[model samples]
Target: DLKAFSKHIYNAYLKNFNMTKKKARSILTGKAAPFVIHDIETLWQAEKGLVWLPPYKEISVHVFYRCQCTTVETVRELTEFAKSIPSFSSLFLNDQVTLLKYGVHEAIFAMLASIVNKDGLLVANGSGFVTREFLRSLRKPFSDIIEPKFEFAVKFNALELDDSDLALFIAAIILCGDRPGLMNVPRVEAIQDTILRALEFHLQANHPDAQYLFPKLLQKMADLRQLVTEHAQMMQRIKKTETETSLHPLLQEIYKD
Candidate 1:
């Protein structure tokens, strides 16, 4: 009955993200690795020996810089993905902004699992594969960022849904009305409900053997919200403690804690 809307969401996922799980692995090619920092020495090389003092010396701020640059790119992609959804585009401009500002990180992290694994995350889409241990080994005020994320993501990968699942999942994350000060809750919730129904139907086709996957995926969405909240908090603490550090303007606006 609802296959039309279900197919629409699935098609959007394909068009917005990629053709398939195997196809989305365009992060790098040829395996010539770029910045594989598995130890403090490689971290130093990655940082280019930037002069550091006091709090900054203890932490590798460049990791944050790289992250912000790459993340802003992902956020922009997320916004475009949302705007591509006709329902999302029809909202008031402010409403659009609110959904994006609030929803981008959650969508980012939800899809992030597509790019990483239990051991490491792909970096530079080149040859750089940053190991989980290295991210954790980083000095405080910075390492805290990826550590928690990896914990969530590794488990997220365990769910075993591919990018097809993520397309609807990311859409579901973006459309929900539960954000802080949404301008049109009913409209947003209605949109979200449509996506949810589509997701529910699509899951049966895609996850036939996984009887409990749909509800569990919903719980994962809820858990991702909390994970991103904690991530934002850690970013806030970094800004406060490292007074001289600057965050990308878009990221700062997005991470307003």
Candidate 2:
């Protein structure tokens, strides 16, 4: 399902490059699930102005799942328990901010409503299952030797992998992360490979689309890689400099004491 969703979105994105919304719709009809469009629009609006140099003129999705805990229920109860509190508006605003910051607005809200209206624990269990499923979908494409673990403890952090693997993982996440329904891992892998090959071919051939998006994504990835590398180098340099600048005689005297 995720794989199919990814493919649909990818096709839609490609169409968007040169076609109008009407044309894109014609291409997507019966191919993409209705919820896919809804999720895309929601993410697009949520992320507006947050990304520097917007990614493709199209929307990308990142799927997330949240656990509904007693804390969450209590918070909701306390907040809605009284509509007159001055902090109520701010609390609501902050919740939205947290959802956007974590990129889990759609999943959280969708799950919340489902829990409230239907089976409560069932929705909570489903959230956990969906999160695990999405993570597995991401891991299936790469070699068994290179599994990516998506860590939520840190924001904007990605697993360290070789460029090819990293590219595959990132492309997979982008294309299917926000799909409205389930994703198919095998199909997603196929599409991921296709997109990569297309980019590589275009890069070698110097085609316009490749010239623009391909290189841009690659450059961004390289920049991120460089940031990590450079930071490590800078730390090494600082340590070396500090060692060189330290007073050896003072250290020796202190050791004798």
Candidate 3:
């Protein structure tokens, strides 16, 4: 679900960026001040960098498959997922008010697209692209549901979702903010961990259909968990090695002295 949301945000970023470079740069800078706004901007840059706009066609296919498998396995019921989104403007008016006051529509659309991808109903098509297209048809109506206080409602509603679903939601939100030149790598890494933790908790929770569903979801989560761990470890190792290498001459001089 978050991956789907990420895709939407990615598309939105491209659309906006193509329209106006200046506006896009402002968003990437996180100049809006509020923590939520800042986080959104940071996420946009991070995801964009990681996912890469104009992903190779083959890679895009892989990414789409990975996103769908993870989301469906985590959420379970498509119908319940569909029902979670509100269809009127009153839902998030307050948060929208704040965003609007700051002229953050680009950010708002990024958030909206994420929400729509998560809860908008989809036809049972094998390819996610077709399903997403159908959902896009409903975007205008869905946009009406977003209002200023929507973030509060979203947070409240999130409590009812399984941890995995919630994590995916947050991940989607972060990914929506991702953009190639705009993201902060360290922050994205931190949020990625949070997402993985949520997925792990869901796998360990033991639902009624654990026998049928848990194994698949568990394996997927584990694989992703391992991937993230390896990445983080690699980054750390590189940073440490770089720092040590930079000090090598100084250390040698001190020892000689």
Candidate 4:
């Protein structure tokens, strides 16, 4: 029963995620051709002096814009992915929104580890690698905001989970019954229990020799909670200090509480 559930979730994962780690790594290693180049060094090397940095604006602005756009797309995908799960779709509409509002950032950051490594993230549909140094070079608040996620992603990547594992993890994050304001706590908790059971069962077969991975992932979920809390706090600072910068409406709503 759980095996079939896992298959259903895996299929939803493949359908929803735009760039899987497998594909991202393929592009990273040049096994597959990327449609465009987002890395500065690679672009300059390939196209000579034809490229220019966004000279008209601050680096933080452009970087933040890219982050916003990518985040918006990911949120859209997450919403669709959440709805695909039979248990998740059974929730009251308001409760579904409540879960997403509280849980989406954690899910987004968790999935982000797939495309990120010690160096940086694969941007532009895995077309280019943006280095850690480049992101850290941004001005104070922006750099401060990014460094923690890089740290989290680096450590999270060490777990070496495949998309199937992550599919259940993401669903678990979203179906969390502990999220404040959830109206149907017992029902949500029931669904979360089933997802966790399936995740544990899947892990037994998928990583038979890997010890402690199940608890480790649970720990990672806790870590994600802390990371997103800090991220929201940093965003609050940006809203106050960087008055000119605009957050995407959806992101703004997610961070509002």
Candidate 5:
């Protein structure tokens, strides 16, 4: 019963996302550089005035804005992924937006692990790597926005999850019952329970001897929730003081209450 259910979501995962961790891991290690069409290009198309022609500037403002550009594109992908989930699309239209508003950052950060390591992350579809030191060198608060995610990604990467695991993990994040404003709590909770059970079942077979992995993943979800809160707080600060840099309206909509 749940087997087919899981496969359906897995199929959606394959369909909606541009890159899976399996593909990314190969790209991260291999040198042929398949000319992969991935995040950076979609990000440029999503937002203009991006500094994608990176000799990535040292200026914190420039770096921060680039981060936002990447974020906007990821949000678009997350939104599409969420909508593709049958239970998610069945929710009221407003509830759909509400889940994305609260859930997108967490989902983005979780997926960030696919490209990240302790030192840095893959950029330009694995054609480049940006060192953690460079990211930390950005001006205060701007640097603050990125470092924690690096730390989280480093720890998360130890879990050694591939894309199939992440698909369910991300779905769980978006369908979370704790999001502040939901028109239908019970229904969301029911869907989340199904996702959780599928994840637990999937993990046993996927990582048969990896003791307690399910519990570890649940804790990671809590960590992500807190991370998003701190991120939103920093974003508010940027919104007020860093007015010279503009935020995407879609991002503004997500962050605003």
Candidate 6:
């Protein structure tokens, strides 16, 4: 069955994120730590112990750059994931690119829910996690980017989904056919329908108390779409106003229409 094969491919996608979870030292304390900071907080915490690079831009802007760097890596990981999917790879190259451009952020934000709890998301591939309270403490504009995603993530985590569930869920997000510019809409959508059914079937053992887990996941996907829409607006504002800010080309390419 294509459904079973999808599960096998989904397992491979799960392993990719696990493989990239790197432990990192705190920028403030050289001692092994779980949290890494590349912002103004680093300055106060370091207290001049570590040589600080002069600010190329405002520290607030630094947060976006670093966050987008992680986003870039995730885009690539999702790309590899698409290739790993037998159905996805069967699409034309242009169709693959179209799907990725429209859906990668949606998929990234979904996977983020896994490492994230109500506390905060794991930054830098889980090297260290920055807390939700701390992230909200950052200066305006920059701080606004992540809170909504975190809100969705926390609720998504409440669903208590395992890696198996998330693997299929994210694959569904990436292979979404409703995204504009798909060359073969019916084919793409048929694949999505099959994946969604597999997700429903797989979620049984994954969410035993579940009545509406499948529909809730579908709603969560819709929520991710809105969060991504909001994210793009914020980036556009930053690009227009924050002239000094350097958006990662991979990120810019991803967001810009």
Top TM-score model: 4
**Candidate 4: 10-residue stretch with minimal lDDT:** 47-56
Error of 6 at 44 (Å): 8.5
RMSD of 2: 23.7
- For model 4, residues 1-257, the per-residue Cα lDDT tens digits are 88999999999999998899788767666785543334454545433432222232666776777788888889899999999998888898999999999988999899888888777777767756677877887789998988999899989988889888999999889999999888989999999999999999999999999799999999999999999999989889899999988888888888877
* Local lDDT at 190 for model 4: 95
Off by over 4 Å in 1: 18-20, 24-35, 40-59
Error of 4 at 94 (Å): 0.5
RMSD of each: 4.3, 23.7, 21.3, 3.3, 4.8, 4.5
Tens-digit lDDT string for candidate 3 (1-257): 64544344333333322222233223334452111111233323433543222233332232333333433332322212222322212224433222122212222232222222232311112111112332233323222222312332343333333432433433333322132333244444454454444444454453444454433443433333334344334334433543422222322232221
The TM-score that candidate 3 achieves is: 0.21
For residue 77, model 6's alpha carbon misses the true position, in angstroms, by 0.5
Ten contiguous residues with the weakest lDDT in model 3 = 121-130
Better candidate number, 3 or 5, judged by TM-score: 5
After the best TM-score superposition of candidate 1, give how far the Cα of residue 146 lies from its true spot, in angstroms. 0.8
Give per-model TM-scores: 0.86, 0.19, 0.21, 0.91, 0.88, 0.85
The 10-residue segment of model 6 with minimum total lDDT is: 20-29
* Cα lDDT, all candidates: 0.76, 0.30, 0.31, 0.84, 0.82, 0.74
Identify the runs in model 3 with alpha carbons over 4 angstroms from their true place.
Answer: 1-179, 206-257
Per residue, candidate 2 scores C-alpha lDDT tens digits across 104-182 of: 2211221122222111111222221122222334322211111111221111222112222322323322322223332
Per-residue lDDT of candidate 1, residues 186-238 (tens digit): 99999998888888888898888987888999999899889988987888788
Cα lDDT of model 6 by residue, 1-257, tens digit = 84576568666776566432122112222444444444466534543443222355665665666677678778888888878887889999999999999999998888776666666655544445566776787778788988888888778878767667777888889888888778999989998988888888877766777988999999989998999999899889988887777877777777767
Residues 174-224, candidate 5: write the lDDT tens digits: 998878889899999999999999999999889998999999999999999
Per model, how many backbone clashes are there?
5, 10, 25, 0, 0, 1
